[model samples]
Target chain A: VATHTLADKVVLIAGGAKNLGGLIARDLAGHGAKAVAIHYNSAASQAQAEETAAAVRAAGAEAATFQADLTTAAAVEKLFDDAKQRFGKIDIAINTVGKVLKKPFTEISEAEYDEMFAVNSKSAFFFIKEAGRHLEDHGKLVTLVTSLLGAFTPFYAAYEGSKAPVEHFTRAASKEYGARGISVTAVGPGPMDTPFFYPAEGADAVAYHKTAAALSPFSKTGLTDIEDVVPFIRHLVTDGWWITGQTILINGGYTTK
Target chain B: THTLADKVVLIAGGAKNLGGLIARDLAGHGAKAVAIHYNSAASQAQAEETAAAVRAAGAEAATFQADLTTAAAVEKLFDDAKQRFGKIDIAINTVGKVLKKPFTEISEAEYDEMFAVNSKSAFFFIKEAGRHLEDHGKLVTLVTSLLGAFTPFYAAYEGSKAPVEHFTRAASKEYGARGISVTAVGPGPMDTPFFYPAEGADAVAYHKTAAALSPFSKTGLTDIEDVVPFIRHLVTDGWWITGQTILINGGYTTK
Candidate 1:
């Protein structure tokens, strides 16, 4: 029988520095993960990465930090190899790396489009590609998408469109990896209450999005909290193992499908 | 720069419902001429009615009938449109079929037919449109809102439509160098004859009130008119949006 538990399992979290990724690192350690290989990009996030790594160790789990831009397959391979070298084997992998752009479709420059896809879509693809190669049997893989994928409104064409490909990637990965009992999925949270969310939206748009979901009022930020989404993600990697190949939206009824 | 003043458009499955409305909407927005393509003989009258509406909106309108499941047929559809209008600028495909049966009960024939109509046609449509469209042309494919839902009974329906999202991405990238934007739009259950046949009374009722914004909408279901504006924006001023699949369902379902 395949048991879904983080105990004694090693986890590698892409973008495991601050916000959601940071919290997830701690969450897994608290759940008894033996070791966590934390990866973060951008020099500005280095401090947070160190903080998260130290926090993981303080929680009594072995922790290591890796800094690399994961858009390239080579970098992702390196990240995987380094993590495996330290932790011996990786059982759970979660990629929370993403970038958001809220602008009119016509005004989006080619450079901007390429950058968004690199940070959001391409990085995710390579991360999963590498995870599939390195994860142990009965492993769990997840990539964070966005709740905007369901919205028909304008100004997020690049953001949501890039993230859209990850859904299909999840489907293909789940089926291919299922032979080894690996579960793959994508989770999209509603507009979150992190530094990541505010920079992309203006004041009026932010207020509107804040109350957009049916359960928005009940949430601490009227938006998906990093805290709120971690439980669902943890569950999917653990007890929620059977739910594979699906893109789940965990935003207090903010979005469905 | 934002006007559709001389833009020519080709719409597949453009006879009625969403496609027909798109034709009228584009024409109303000042497109120069519109070519309406229909697959089934039953939709021929709808094609003519839609064409007449385009003409009524002061744009030249023509109707071409073709079964677009085959790549060759799709090629012919685009060739005919370009020949008629001298150039093609915008292409919208609203061709799709819905099956509401259980996943286990789905037959290969049903699956193939659904893919043929939804996926195969969409791939070819994007290919042909990519080849023939003028620089800065727009291509849009209609998908479904059930894509974001976790419900049962829509497996084949959503699965067939799913491939088009990636097709939009690749097509957008390859075509964007010339300023062409490719997108797929999915609408929630609508108040149309096309929707009622696949859904039972109970299912319809359930969908009618399912969206969080349902009560605010004039019709609980997505109105064809409500979706037309978004499509219009994409082809005209919304050109920056490329390689995207968007669902417009009054908050019925979200990703």
Candidate 2:
């Protein structure tokens, strides 16, 4: 029989040092995860990684912090290897590592396109690839995408285009991993309440997205909160494992498929 | 994660081109069995060749003949695959018919055929994949990249393939609670016989250079080999993506 609960499960999170990833680290630890490995990318994020690690321990779980740029296959392999070495086995992996750029399709340069894909698509691909190799049987994998995937809009070509491949990647990994009882999924939150979202938009676009969601009036931030998204992710890696190989846009009716 | 060591897959239009490559790719990944489907009697030899390739790749192979425009035929195809392989873990539909004629020039019969092959068959394929696929199955359908274009003359072609995006969405949501992932892939004007025969010289020349990334391509077209890796990833490690239509056409169009 397969256990769906997070109790005593070892979790390895990519981009786990801050924001959405940090909250998830604490949530899983609070729910009884045995050990949590929090991975941050740049040195700038190392401080948040340590802070998240402290919270995991504060929540009565084992904690470790690791840092690496995850765009390369080798880096992801090492991250997984090191996490497995510390925790014995990884039961869940979450990648919240992403970068966003909004520019006209025609005006976007090759270098911009390449960078967007590297940070968003390529890093995500290797992270999932390594997770599949290292995660224990019946584990769960989740990657953070964007709700723009469900919208028919302009000027977000590079941002959404690169994140597009992650959806396909999710479908493939779920089927392949199903044999081992592992579940894979991607979550696309609406315009979020984080520094990661604001810099990519102008004041007008920012003002528009703030109230874009149908439930914006009810939300404290008038946008999807990190608080709002983490619980759903927690559900997926636990009791919600049945929902595999899917990219779900959880934007409170901001966009509909 | 699961290995393809004992997995069973069913491929519609698994005789030639992209579908054929997918058939062999699954086998090469060590799938336990493959059930190949072909619509035309003319494709029997190609189907056999694909079957041989699957066998050569060290997997079991079986061939089924079906015209999957209707739900019943598709159901029978699924049943045959289930009976032959015992269970199916992945199902891919590469069956499509393209029409590049002007919207006004398209006859009702032509419209019906286009929808029957491209959209309707895809719906039934997803339906059957939902019914017969093992828990945590993967389903993919082939569409056209014109879905993202703002062009003329492809109204019928793009229009017919359009409903599939919704089909993929609904099926993913409905089947999600059961752990089945459903998606659609629309390749750009591919470097295949099915493509050139439907295009004119000027149109071909235009499309060859339309994509920003075309200069980096082998034939200035989306190669089946290039597209194969993504599909392979989807059924294996790229499983987080569901309920979406992915246009893999270099840098041609995006939505």
Candidate 3:
């Protein structure tokens, strides 16, 4: 009775404006999603949000854009409510919201620590909470984490520490929502060829990361490509629903756990 | 130079239970001073008792009180200890919270409280130690072995504690430059008041026999007596074991 396909599904994405989020929006629309609700956090990202929504519409899917800072539970709830009001139901939810801080453990200030957790951990928590409340039976949920979790490196205590909680969140969410046929999982990609990756790394660090993966030589940028990651996410929300409660790293053997 | 003798130490959650035992153990082993931190007013009498016991072991003992979920509070605790002891040589964080609940039933407040007690407190404690500890200092954080288990009903508990693994790793690399060693220890279902309140009798019974060496332990669970010696070694001569989360259970789970 279940095809496990994206056909006729309605979806909501937090931080769905640009980069990988934008690509996933367009990909899901092309894969037969009936409607897509795209959420962007700030006024700076509004244009990209509109552009992504247009691409979704161009793919023959109905699209709407919602704006909200998703650090609070109420803001996350409102995003889901607005999407459901527009589309009548939500079949999938994805959170690509995160912030990276590369600083020494001793030098990091209290304000910076609080902000990193607010964006990376708190938003992910409430997003999962809201998704658990709003998604239809058999829905799918995914949160974007990072491959740094599997690394024992320095200068990322706040960045990696904040995102680490999502792995357990995925585990618990999967079990709690399993009876309803919903799948919850977190994805951690290797250093990608994106603006997000470059801002936090220096030239020396960037050069090292570019060649860190086992399969670096074969890849276009010697980094995890967004193109490579999109298909896997599409599968998880569709035919790959059986692989639940796990944090899968889609890197080129960059790190294993 | 790395021996416990003549060394000054600060222990968060050092008032009672496993922390109390650790304070006494280190004091008896020739630690110069043990600065103990207890969180609640309810823990004050027990804290003074632990301090008295440390003094009886011939070590200088002092007690400070703070709910250490905030960065400011953690800083103040470290500052007060440094002021009393002159220089802190080692730091141990034995603070954590356990919650056994289905993920759906966990409320926002409970989730926040769990993270505050487990993750946030550990982070700032490490931060303060990094700032205040003398050269060649040692840092240890008490985590839970549930981090290695794949079971349900402990999402918030295990998840919040999960961050400390990376924190240990990152802190070790950063502090290694200064000859400081940082590590996290996770003991399986500890035999303390901390474990029983969060578990049902059936679950407790199951955990009692869960570890491979459970039968060898006095209470069929990881005893504080056993865990403290390993921590003692870590903060002393076992300084080479850095940046790893060692599961001290009798083989309950392996990463």
Best by lDDT: 3
Specify the CAPRI tier of model 1: incorrect
Chain B TM-score by candidate, in order shown: 0.98, 0.98, 0.99
TM-score of chain A, model number 3: 0.98
Question: Between the candidate structures 2 and 3, which one is better when assessed by DockQ?
Answer: 3
- Write down the TM-score of every candidate: 0.59, 0.55, 0.97
Task: Report the lDDT tens digits of candidate 2 across residue range B23-79.
Answer: 999899888988999989999999999999999999999999999877679889999
RMSD (Å) per prediction: 11.3, 21.6, 1.4
Estimate, for each residue in A102-140, the C-alpha lDDT of model 2 and write its tens digit.
Answer: 754335554665576667766776677677777888899
Q: Sort by lDDT, best first.
A: 3, 1, 2
Return whichever of 2 and 3 wins on TM-score: 3
* Error in Å for residue B79 of model 2: 54
User: Share of real interface contacts recovered by each model?
Assistant: 0.02, 0.00, 0.76
Docking class of 3: medium
Give the CA lDDT, 0 to 100, for residue A187 in model 2. Answer: 97
Candidate 1 structure quality by residue, lDDT tens digits, A42-84: 8999999999999999998999999998876568779999999
Give the runs in model 3 whose Cα sits over 4 Å from its true position: none
How do the residues B103-190 of candidate 1 rate in per-residue lDDT, one tens digit apiece?
3355546755776677667767877887799998899999988777655566557756775776676677677788888898999999
Q: Write the per-residue lDDT of candidate 3 for residues A29-91, one digit (tens) a residue.
A: 999999989999889999999999999999999999999988776788799999999999999
